[PDB]
A and B are shown apart, each in its own frame.
Chain A
Amino acid sequence: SKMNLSEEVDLEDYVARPDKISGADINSICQESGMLAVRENRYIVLAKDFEKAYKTVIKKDEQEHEFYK
């Protein structure tokens, strides 16, 4: 509600997707999605901006060594 938002983005689609997203992680997805719009000079955050940040936030293993499964 604080950010301008696309006004066409469906926030529910991101919520329906699973993953162990903490409150801090959810804050990162929203803040990064707004930041990505600022980087591309868009005053209104866009649906595509949310997905890229969402993937960035779900870094998950990120590194790891494959063995240790």
Chain B
Amino acid sequence: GYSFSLTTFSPSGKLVQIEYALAAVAGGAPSVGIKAANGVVLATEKKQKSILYDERSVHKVEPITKHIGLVYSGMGPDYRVLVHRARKLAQQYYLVYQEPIPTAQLVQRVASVMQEYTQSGGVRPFGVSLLICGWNEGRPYLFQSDPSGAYFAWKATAMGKNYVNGKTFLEKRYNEDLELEDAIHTAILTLKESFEGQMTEDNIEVGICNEAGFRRLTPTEVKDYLAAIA
């Protein structure tokens, strides 16, 4: 009877439905986030199933505020719903306090939205995991919000297929005194380890959040980093 509902406790441990949602997050395109001394760099593997799909349409790394960006691993339709809500909460903060939302607070507010779906009822939890980034307070911030609603901060993290391989790669090569450009190279390399194919400017989408804002790298820019190694 357990594992079919999020409104009932496991007869010993914890509700299984949230854990199944985590399984859907695990079955996602690899996403790598590398916090660096001067910025946070986020990346995902965007591979179209067929040549026909246009690579300039739906975008995996999407800006939420001028200084805040989000990346996702998990079911793609669910991501758009939270991308809209996160953006809206950032606007409501600006109207109420006339300041861009701090990155830490946005993650807490986004997490509360995700927790509401996990609440009792027909509603099923979001199947996406997120990697919010920010440059608020002069400090680079990288955070993760899970379907359950827990939020954590990562110097570097990976989600989706081969998260373990990526995390072990990150353990070996991530230092701390590294510029965003060096962080860009490491982020591309971790995706390459889990990339089933040859990475191309279209294949990888990379987004940076330096002390200027969150700007998705232009396809030409991604190609230059993919070229010359990395």
Contacts and interface: CB of A to CB of B under 8 A. Distances in A.
Interface of A: 17-20, 58, 60-61, 64, 66-69
B191 to A, nearest CB: 12
A19 B196 contact: yes
A66 B76 CA distance: 9
B75 A61 contact: no
Contacts, number: 31
Contacts of A66: 49, 76
Contacts of B195: 18
Interface of B: 24, 27-29, 49, 73-77, 127, 160, 195-198
Given A19-B196, A68-B24, A68-B127, 10 more contacts: A18-B196, A19-B197, A61-B49, A66-B49, A67-B75, A67-B77, A68-B27, A68-B75, A69-B28, A69-B75
Contact of B196 (A60, A64, A67, A69): A60
Contacts of A17: 198
Nearest to B196: A19
The 4 closest A-B pairs by CB, nearest first: A69-B28, A69-B29, A69-B76, A19-B196
B73 A69 contact: yes
A60 B29 CA distance: 14
B77 A18 contact: no
A18 B197 contact: yes
Contacts of B28: 68-69
B20 to A, nearest CB: 13
A61 B195 CA distance: 14
Interface centre among B28, B127, B195, B196 (most CB of A within 10 A): B196
A58 B47 CA distance: 15
A67 B81 CA distance: 14
